[PDB]
Write an enzyme that holds these catalytic residues in place. Sequence first.
Site: not given
Length: 247
Positions: A52, A109, A158, A179
């Site tokens: 990212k 993602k 998640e 997470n």
Amino acid sequence: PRYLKGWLKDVVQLSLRRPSFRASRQRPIISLNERILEFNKRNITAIIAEYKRKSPSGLDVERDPIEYSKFMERYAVGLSILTEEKYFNGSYETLRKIASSVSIPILMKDFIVKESQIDDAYNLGADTVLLIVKILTERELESLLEYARSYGMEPLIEINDENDLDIALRIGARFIGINSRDLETLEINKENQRKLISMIPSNVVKVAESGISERNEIEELRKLGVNAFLIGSSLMRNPEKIKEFIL
């Protein structure tokens, strides 16, 4: 999707209107959760390296996607590629180029709220997708899980709190990401992450996400039953750090 506020509300509206990408799958599905189990039995630390360039919790990082991916192909159990455009500066083209270059499993993602995004992931070459409990109703979550599974993908679901966990279990999730960062406030709470990990049945493949900067953290989490680790920022800044994490 659920009733949201802030940047989450915005990113979800962005995903609802996201056009699909015209592409044909050029690789087979290489299961990420299965490869994680493979690493566990060989006793190799399983790290999912995340790519990212931008994020709401860090400064921008410019790194060639292909070089990063080819490097990670030699050490990581799999890759997590951001495709969300506005806040993470990701793109379907980047996923497509990476998927065509490496042969380790790839997790797309993004903030998936509709079926066509799963079609996109499949067509671009991703092996699985992330589904976030806090932005979807229970009905939407189960529906998207069933849809991903029809392609042969076992999505990473998640969770961030007890309510998310309860819903993940009710819908039959088998691959759960815990997470430590609350997407809404961007706050990290490691004590809550450890509490959730201990409530997940042992037959579910568990992935600890966010806030890992050192090997000692990985070892402690591994003793708690965590199967794999998703690490982004520290590896984006220093890719070679993975060698230090996997020993």
